[PDB]
């Protein structure tokens, strides 16, 4: 991916609390280790983001970088990518080695806007696999 | 690897402080990302583990399991293994994905146990690849 596809202007403080996986997609169809569920996002004082997820919870700290939407995790390098978010409804977030990306919603309220834009998204990376859940 | 190859009654307390790598070994020869120099533990006083240690300082927490030489790591399951150790001189710790270990020294003194006892570990597993520095 590029610098160009990440989010301007995040604010990572306003990404606090629970988030719900609605679809995911990845570069090879073996990577859903990866299949793993973002069920909350906790910003440090410090710019650093704790990640809580499902796989079992796991607690995972992605490190803030010189790119405000980029954050560094381990033996294995990951980059956490937040390409985009509007804070209050969606948070379209990529996991890279290479590539998984979710589809995050604040409620499983009836809305398409977060799955048309993680859609629009997905059209610019090369995907081998997509799921989406009820 | 098996738990009777782990060490009998480890207090993960005594571990705590520096430690050099004298020695790497590993299963497949493209593993030496494991390629990671343990410079510090520090157990908590919950039990769990952080390491310190160079690739740039990455700062790793293994945390407990129900094997007391055996701590979890992340999205890519690692664990690390005490094989052994004295406390005041050397410690024999193996990362898991499959298997790279470490021969750990309090101080790089002229004395050849660690060493010794690192090679009549490595015995019994089966690695592809050894190496040494000064």
């Given at each position: 991916?590029?610098v160009?596809?990440?989010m ?8 606090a ?5 609605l ?12 299949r ?11 710019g ?24 560094k995790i381990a ?16 948070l379209?977030?990529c996991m890279?080695?290479?590539?998984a ?6 409620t499983p ?23 989406s859940?009820?």
């Amino acid at each position: 991916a590029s610098v160009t596809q990440t989010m301007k202007g995040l604010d990572i403080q306003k990404v606090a609390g629970t988030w719900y996986s609605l679809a995911m997609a990845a570069s090879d169809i073996s990577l859903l280790p990866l299949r793993v569920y973002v069920e909350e996002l906790k910003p440090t004082p410090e710019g650093d983001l704790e990640i809580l997820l499902q796989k079992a919870q796991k607690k995972i700290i992605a490190e803030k970088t010189k790119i405000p939407a980029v954050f560094k995790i381990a033996l294995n390098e990951n980059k956490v990518l937040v390409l985009d978010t509007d804070y209050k409804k969606y948070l379209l977030l990529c996991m890279e080695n290479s590539l998984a990306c979710q589809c995050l919603v604040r409620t499983p309220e009836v809305d398409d806007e977060a799955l048309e834009k993680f859609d629009k998204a997905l059209k610019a990376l090369p995907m081998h696999i997509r799921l989406s859940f009820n």
